[PDB]
Ligand SMILES: O=P(O)(O)OC[C@@]1(O)OC[C@@H](O)[C@@H](O)[C@@H]1O
């Protein structure tokens with residue numbers, strides 16, 4: 001089901017737009033927003049917090065358990081809205097977190113659930129997934145909320161059709177991605193991204209980790225030179241995700257190749273940075289631009305998993321919903 | 325070899341830090357809104373400082389230098405009353421580039437007079453000198469020096485340096501125990517876990533293992549690990565749980581990892597048996613200083629694992645002591 005779900009990304013964008021239009025005039029997102037989630041939903045929370053800041057607001061993201069047990073170490077301050085993100089809407093930690101919150105609560109989930117019952121409003125984006133690994137729901141949740149955020153902040157709406165078609169372009173790379181997995185049997189991998197693409201790198205790494213029971217890491221693009229690069233050699237694939245690369249990116253690619261690693265560049269640029277593999281995606285509004293990158297990293301993780309005889313639908317030791 | 329010698333200078337580093345603090349305490353006033361910038365281990369130290377700043381009623385945010393340089397708009401920086409640039413060498417290009425773009429007051433934290441100190445309004449020069457490419461005792465020394473300055477600035481009483489230094493001497497007493505774990509359980513990957521102030525310590529611990537042993541190491545906020553990340557832990561994995569005051573969930577988590585076949589080392593300030601295979605109890609200190617004794621433990625673990633693999637922690641492959649552009 002994992003592959004089928006990744007391929008439903010284009011439709012997920014359309015479903016998200018529909019939900020946005022249904023609730024847009026029922027809730028107005030404020031300036032100070034706290035985002036809470038676990039696992040992939042935490043990485044989505046980080047992404048939402050980032051785009052909130054990008055558009056002039058003040059967003060902070062924290063893992064549910066850190067809010068539950070160590071909130072004093074985080075710069076939360078006054079919260080005008082608390083957003084709880086949970087694909088299942090049943091994760092014990094998010095429910096525990098929200099019951100401690102008194103301010104307005106907005107839930108983001110795929111279904112009517114325990115979560116929606118404890119929130120004042122909710123974005124129920126029906127990007128249903130049977131797989132334990134979150135795929136198109138991440139992308140769909142992001143778009144639905146982004147539309148709502150832009151709307152609340154007085155910005156023009158994004159073109160859902162254009163963005164959905166952009167993800168169809170990402171899916172055209174399926175065979176090429178399969179070829180990467182077939183031609184280079186990497187033993188570990190590093191995902192790199194800056195700004196909005198950093199949370200995407202974190203999510204990408206988790207996809208690879210869950211689906212492939214793999215050694216995968218993720219870092220803000222240039223932070224990797226600070227010790228982290230020591231574990232990259234001829235058995236490593238480095239995935240650099242960048243919208244508009246500059247000289248430092250070319251130097252970084254060269255640096256990794258000098259260590260023997262192979263480099264895959266996913267960008268919105270026609271520039272040759274010296275990469276071994278290249279995936280060019282349609283450039284969109286800066287805030288929506290990360291969307292087409294998700295299906296690419298999801299497909300890469302899926303095919304690497306299959307190449308190891310693993311079942312991405314039900315990774316060993318994992319539960320679909322973490323409960324306590 | 326200098327790495328082990330440097331790890332063992334942790335106790336003295338605390339004393340050196342206290343001396344610097346007392347020399348500059350009335351020359352530097354720390355504000356409410358502070359931005360912390362650093363790279364690599366210095367970034368993880370920045371996260372720790374930002375957290376303790378929040379813990380004490382201030383507003384601290386930490387960012388890797390390059391993210392501030394090229395993607396600051398995606399972060400909740402807001403109004404900055406002070407920018408703190410952390411760099412052991414004081415020569416990292418990214419920190420120099422970051423600070424020159426800032427107009428507000430700038431404080432540097434480094435081990436030596438350098439390019440960094442020359443562009444800051446003032447600096448905490450803590451002479452915890454290190455020849456190893458891997459940062460060790462300078463991390464805790466920098467932390468203590470600033471922590472004292474923060475407490476003083478915020479009207480709180482001073483921490484007892486001698487007591488904290490002694491606490492790290494207790495950490496070092498576990499050297500044999502740690503060496504023997506490395507010699508008996510040949511783990512192939514490792515996961516460090518910590519919450520609150522111990523999360524940045526887990527991040528730093530993981531980097532120490534990564535740099536010193538060219539190892540597969542990961543770090544996560546304690547309970548976040550159940551959310552998919554735990555899939556890579558099995559009988560070849562050592563899970564290191566760092567916790568000051570464990571409760572019911574910690575015992576359950578330890579048991580969950582053992583059920584996957586992994587062995588668990590618990591480093592805590594509690595005598596409670598959570599079911600761990602290995603146990604290291606450290607002296608409990610003031611909440612803000614409590615993380616200090618944990619550093620030499622993880623540094624020693626990374627060092628011995630490196631030696632067991634015939635690797636030289638002083639000069640990890642591919643690494644430059646100072647990253648320049
Ligand atoms: O709170 P949710 O978004 O339902 O889910 C959070 C999550 O960590 O739960 C356990 C696993 O299924 C993970 O793959 C998933 O991302």
Ligand SMILES: O=P(O)(O)OC[C@@]1(O)OC[C@@H](O)[C@@H](O)[C@@H]1O
Pocket residue numbers: 225226227363364365366410411412413414415416419457458459535643644645646647
């Ligand atoms: O800015 P600094 O704190 O000098 O150093 C930052 C750092 O990443 O530089 C490269 C290596 O030596 C690393 O071990 C070190 O932590």
